[PDB]
Amino acid sequence: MTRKDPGSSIWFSLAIDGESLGYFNGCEGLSTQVEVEQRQEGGNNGFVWQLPTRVTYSNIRLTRPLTPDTAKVAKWISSVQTGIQRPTAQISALRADGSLVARWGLIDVLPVSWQGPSLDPGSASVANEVLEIAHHGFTD
Amino acid sequence: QYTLFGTAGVPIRATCQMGLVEIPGPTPNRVHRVVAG
């Protein structure tokens, strides 16, 4: 037991391989869904049958402080015209010891949206560019 | 249209449209006065 090794939501490690995107700073929305189909039996009141049908992986929003290395992301996104590349990503959650609690690796990524910084003279914060990521499956 | 089928197959809720058209009932079997104008 060793007083267990509980999960946490601060220590992590977010990275994208391939183009020199580097390490990100915040994940969101990592989710897998299936699309159940509801067929209602006519002669048996009481419930609707639930039958599984396919699985579907939702998009992921990754955020990081606006660093001068943001030119790489715009280069990657605007490379669709001349040919794109799908590198392999990773999303890992850690405890403060630096050990591993669960490691997910995105099979193939693809940019979807890039919400840039929201400049504002009165708001004291730090610009957080958002890079949405498309998905193809988990790794194992 | 049948809906809400009960157990053992008997229908329960049924909606039935109807189209009706009338049938004629025919064959039900000139003095005038005079005014100054």
**Is A52 in the B-facing interface, judged by CB distances under 8 Å?**
no
Amino acid identity at A63? T
Give contacts of B9 with chain A, Cβ < 8 Å: 43
Could you give the residue ranges of the DSSP H alpha helices within chain A? 71-77
Q: Which residues pair with A15 in a beta bridge?
A: A23, A90
Mutation test of the interface with chain B: which of A45, A47, A48, choosing the one with the most B Cβ atoms within 10 A? A45
Q: What is the DSSP letter of B30?
A: -
Q: How determined?
A: cryo-EM
Q: What is the DSSP letter of A9?
A: S
User: In which region does residue A72 sit, left (phi positive, over 0), alpha (psi from -120 to 50) or beta (all else)?
Assistant: alpha
Residue A131, SS3? Answer: strand
Q: How far is B14 from chain A (nearest CA, A)?
A: 13
Tokens coding A9: 């939501």
Note the resolution in Å, 1 decimal.
3.5
Give contacts of B13 with chain A, Cβ < 8 Å: none
CA A54/CA A36 separation, integer angstroms: 8
Question: What H or E segment, with its residue span, contains residue A94?
Answer: strand A89-94
